[PDB]
Design an enzyme around this catalytic site. Sequence first.
Site, PDB file in Angstrom:
ATOM      1  N   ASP A  67      27.736 -14.768  37.092  1.00 42.21           N
ATOM      2  CA  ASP A  67      28.252 -13.339  36.510  1.00 42.21           C
ATOM      3  C   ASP A  67      28.205 -13.601  35.072  1.00 42.21           C
ATOM      4  O   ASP A  67      29.357 -13.171  34.459  1.00 42.21           O
ATOM      5  CB  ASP A  67      29.464 -13.095  36.959  1.00 42.21           C
ATOM      6  N   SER A 116      38.055  -8.133  35.049  1.00 39.56           N
ATOM      7  CA  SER A 116      38.176  -9.568  34.687  1.00 39.56           C
ATOM      8  C   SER A 116      37.360  -9.356  33.154  1.00 39.56           C
ATOM      9  O   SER A 116      36.169  -9.203  33.184  1.00 39.56           O
ATOM     10  CB  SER A 116      36.950 -10.091  35.523  1.00 39.56           C
ATOM     11  N   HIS A 153      28.371  -8.518  35.212  1.00 43.03           N
ATOM     12  CA  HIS A 153      28.804  -7.394  36.001  1.00 43.03           C
ATOM     13  C   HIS A 153      29.018  -5.851  35.018  1.00 43.03           C
ATOM     14  O   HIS A 153      29.219  -4.707  35.604  1.00 43.03           O
ATOM     15  CB  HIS A 153      29.829  -7.324  36.845  1.00 43.03           C
TER      16      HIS A 153
END
Lengths: 396, 396, 396, 346
Positions: free
Chosen positions: C98, C165, C68
């Site tokens: 991801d 994150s 991401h």
Amino acid sequence: QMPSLAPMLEKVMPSVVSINVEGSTTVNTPRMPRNFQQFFGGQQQKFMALGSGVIIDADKGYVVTNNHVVDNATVIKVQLSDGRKFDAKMVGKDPRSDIALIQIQNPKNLTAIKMADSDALRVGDYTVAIGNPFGLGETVTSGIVSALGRENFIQTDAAINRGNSGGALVNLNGELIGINTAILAPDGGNIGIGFAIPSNMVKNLTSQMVEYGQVKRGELGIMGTELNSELAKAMKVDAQRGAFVSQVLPNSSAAKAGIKAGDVITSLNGKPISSFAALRAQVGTMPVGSKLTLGLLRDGKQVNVNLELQQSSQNQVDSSSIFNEMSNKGKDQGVVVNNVKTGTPAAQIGLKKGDVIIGANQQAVKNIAELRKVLDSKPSVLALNIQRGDSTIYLL
Amino acid sequence: QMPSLAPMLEKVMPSVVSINVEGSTTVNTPRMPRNFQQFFGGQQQKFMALGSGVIIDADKGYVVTNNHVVDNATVIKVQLSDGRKFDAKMVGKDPRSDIALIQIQNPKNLTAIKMADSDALRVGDYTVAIGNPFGLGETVTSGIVSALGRENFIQTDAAINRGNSGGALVNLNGELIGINTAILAPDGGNIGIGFAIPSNMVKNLTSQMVEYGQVKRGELGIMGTELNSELAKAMKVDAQRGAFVSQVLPNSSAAKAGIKAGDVITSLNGKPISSFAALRAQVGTMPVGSKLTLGLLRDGKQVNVNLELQQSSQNQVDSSSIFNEMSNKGKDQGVVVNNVKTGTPAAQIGLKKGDVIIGANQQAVKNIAELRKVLDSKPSVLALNIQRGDSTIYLL
Amino acid sequence: QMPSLAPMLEKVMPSVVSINVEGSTTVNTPRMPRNFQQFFGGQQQKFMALGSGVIIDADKGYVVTNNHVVDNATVIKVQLSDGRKFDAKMVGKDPRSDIALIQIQNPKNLTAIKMADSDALRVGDYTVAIGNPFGLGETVTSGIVSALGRENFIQTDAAINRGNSGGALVNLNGELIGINTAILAPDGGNIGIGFAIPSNMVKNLTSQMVEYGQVKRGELGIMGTELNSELAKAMKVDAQRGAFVSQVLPNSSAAKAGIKAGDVITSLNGKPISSFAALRAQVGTMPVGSKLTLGLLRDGKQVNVNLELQQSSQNQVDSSSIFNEMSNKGKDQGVVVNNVKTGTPAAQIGLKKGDVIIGANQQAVKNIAELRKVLDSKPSVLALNIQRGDSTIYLL
Amino acid sequence: AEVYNKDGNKLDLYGKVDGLHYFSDNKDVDGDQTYMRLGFKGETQVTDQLTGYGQWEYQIQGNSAENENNSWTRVAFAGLKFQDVGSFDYGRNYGVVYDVTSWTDVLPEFGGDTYGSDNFMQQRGNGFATYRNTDFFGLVDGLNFAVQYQGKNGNPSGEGFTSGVTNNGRDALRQNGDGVGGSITYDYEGFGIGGAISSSKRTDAQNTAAYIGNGDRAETYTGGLKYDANNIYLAAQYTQTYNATRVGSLGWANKAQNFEAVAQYQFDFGLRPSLAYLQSKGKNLGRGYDDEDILKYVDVGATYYFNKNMSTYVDYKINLLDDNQFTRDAGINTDNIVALGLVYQF
């Protein structure tokens, strides 16, 4: 048996106090009726604040705390962890660091925390925070040193979800390593992690409030922001990579020495200035009377000048043990009073807008620490040897 | 090698279970169409809840959990940590503490946690929470004892950002120290930190549900709030510093003995009552049949009286192993049934609004524990020796 | 003295890097004026992203990070913890997990973390996360293993309230145990706790990107959802307990082999399929060219078929060191190019929609790893031996 | 009913009689509410591209004794329309904010009351000059926009006012300075999405101490969503306002947040049940009111259509506002109401 932080917490808690502030402020007058489907756009209003503080001098009853708690206080109360209650008075505050000093009135048998050396902190180091999250009392939470800035704000995960920026940050030895703050000004409450002023800076800012009345931080007196603001566009600024001068403060050194809104500072003592930020922080590493030559931009303008004490950190009704906004002036050149108010209790006493006070009601008042040192020893007869430049009057 | 909580967690997990509740409730009938730019202002609706619980009696299959999970349950399922599935039935619940007891139907080879002594808890003590945060399963999180109330709700930073108030709070020895709760009623979810009922209180409230059918907590039967409410103003209350009586509950002791909305209680057994809060908590430190004289305020009114079991903690379709809202009456003076419903399955059986049951289908039913102790042993012939004051009928 | 994580953090930090991505994307053209009391309902736009990564191969300068962060990157910069700056290029990415791989251009004196064995993780195990929460830098936070999925996403309470994150999840020995991710796609930011891909899966997905150009994950090429969707109702689906087929992807195996929107898959190789979820995850445990027979439902339809590489994980302007969306085709049967664009820099070079490339500008290109292995060794003369089925042309 | 259609002129004469009764503990709304509406819409073909039109609608209460007459003009405007370009009209008309908020104003009796009439550019009002473009020059089917100006409607004339007067002046709760607004809506198949903005100068008569919510201008920002197909109607609107929402008789809300949602279904046999929720939440109201609900209710009802000319309905307003000092001062209804109506229309 099992490990526990309770044994050192018992040696620490007696130094942590609770603080209840009562005070007022100016709010706008509500316009009625109220229409919640109509997005629009003077009277004193009492408010209550509460926070934590740390006893830093057992004898003098000196407690360190956040400026966002005691700011605008009229009445500040302190309750020890054993339950004894006391009154406190403002001795100092500094909105930049969000750090303030207070003094318990009439201390008796107090315990002070030992301050550790901030400079020896490292990221994996263990941390413990103590504060009053939601009012319900004194909560301790634990964790580690997350980021060591490197101003050295300390970052730690020992915070609290949705709670108000508590106070003490202590290491595993029970020594003070930082005072937790709120970087969400005129709010209190965190961004997700915790920010603390390091203990060494706390010690330093704190002593200044004691021995001078305020912290020696000089301001360039400009006010402005980045090159993105609506005014940097609405006024179309050429070459954008610096600090935008929205206005030059009145009676300032920037004003006095020369400068006018629009110019974008590009450097400070040779070094590049790419953002108000960079600049606001750089001017904060320079005590009063210092001289700092910076380059401006209009077509290619540049000057050199000397700054004076900032106006953010000032005093009010705590200089004269009685009751009534001065601050220090240059070096030990007395105490210069600033913007008087409307109630005029102090103006009513023959004190204008720029009145210095070198006379300690008889003696030398090179500063507010001294001045206040006299308005506390001899509360009998008081004649303020003030001289606002020329007039050297002696009011009571 | 490296330290880890996994070794004690392996001795703890077999006692933590998952709980799936299925049940219904009364919702209002949706009015259509729906206009989202129009701020406005009966049918059963099924819902699903899920939470954690702790095995507290391996033999009886007794699991402690939150009342906000099992409340209104029609079907309550339990799944052990090894994956075995069981059915469970309500045995008790108490909305004040947000604590409930259930019983696994047909337990086989279960493990119960050992309960530690809440009273020996201290703030720096280490803590570990176990729960089912977002449904996705059994999550454990760690931390320390943040605040020891001192009701002694335990405060701990071993919570979860935006998650539902899990269940077990355990110390480093794997012993139960508190059951985590939700102080955001009829919601579930936390304020930022965790609140647990202490293990010693859990033990105490839990035994009552077992040996009586419900917890012996007497209510003063008044309902009201603070002196800030719109009704304290809309009715202008003189001398404001106490509990505002918005209404006196029907068939109550406050009602029976004497009292009427408006009076603001000022004391309870001589001691000052400055808030409904103070009062609601004080009346909660007194078991049924107790006598507590309090001072009211109208012009200067005061009385003395004895309270009866509260109505919040009650039973429903779990007394008679069959299916169908009673509660206890005074001391061991039978089991008094309360407000019957509309479906009337139990009213249809000759049970009115105030029908006691001292006859255990033949024997003594001084309480719901006993009564239910019989409707479980002999499910053959059932004749309820009920006597609602006068009428002493014997229905099937 | 006192325990601290600083000693192992000092052996870990040199492996954690910061990542600054610059890139563009297609946004819709703003319609003016703007009315904020009017809820409504092509141009490239530059954006900036920033995240953390972990050096996983010191010699090759291989850094693992989240997809991401680097997704849509045009320029990806890396800054070591000592402050040295480098440039990086995409080598691989996989939106499902991801997880993405990059390569520092021109590495010099790098340090790589040691990867620990994910399979040996247990819940009470200690955990430490390292990331760049709010941009302000590299923050480390600590905690424990909360849930071990059992795909084995790792759950940990070492997260951050409201932050993005981060990246590395490390054990007390400084070994990599998982890369923290964001399950709040096309957002970044957490649900309340942390989710990490386990180190063993990271190792596995990462090697594939290296030795093939992309990860070997076959797709069934259907797209759809649950049986609750408005389309499952608006089309009234009989027997609801499976995956709803909203559409069969073009040029797919589901398409080729046979299937049409509406049918609800009920099983996959005999086993029950109760949700798209179950299915999306099951098809993810099968590498390209595999054969999986599943049961559909229309009246009672069922088929068997073989899937090809998914389209989510693909390459772009990093195959030819130059600049310009291919992917692998079946086994080592060359590199098949997919959907060409509008700017057409690569289509302009004689490359259509389905053009394979078995000729390594002269040699064998069974895959993108190899192909790219040549467009990096001999950047002089380039003749792409492409053959889109029949036409076997040789463009430059 | 079209009563004339000849040589390119058409006249539609329409109306209804609603035999209507309210049941409520609130006696100020309780009782006979019978009324009639009458109107005409006329159109004249000027050329193949240009059409002129006019519309007029009037309401006459049917629930009073014969010694009084309670009636008013709802709309009255004239306009021009040009094929594939747009339209313009001027008169008493609907404000452009209603292009979006009208989507939830579909309830049998109640609803549509997070705003009112003569309430800046929110609903019906005087002196609207309205420009509309449909389908973007006929090149984007379903996309419509509008821009609107409202002239000042000030203090009454002949009453001794020394400023702010207009010929058609009125009480301050129904005044407005000059205003401008705009709306955009897009409808594809059954779906609809829309937005609107209005900004009106507030008059000096409105900005006195006698009214809460003093401010230079009244602003509104609205978003809306709609679904209308397969015998299902769903819609919701959200509006944020500044010095624009009335708070009963007290004045206006400094800020308000309004929300309306509706769900309706049409059975083949003629029954159309309806469920709705409306609320208006005021903030920073002044005079110590602080944050208060201005409106909050659930509406459950149903209409039965005998045909396109005769229908009957029941609407039940379940009023979630509680009786407090604020609602008492403002005169806001807090009681439930049941409406029963029987309607003939042509």
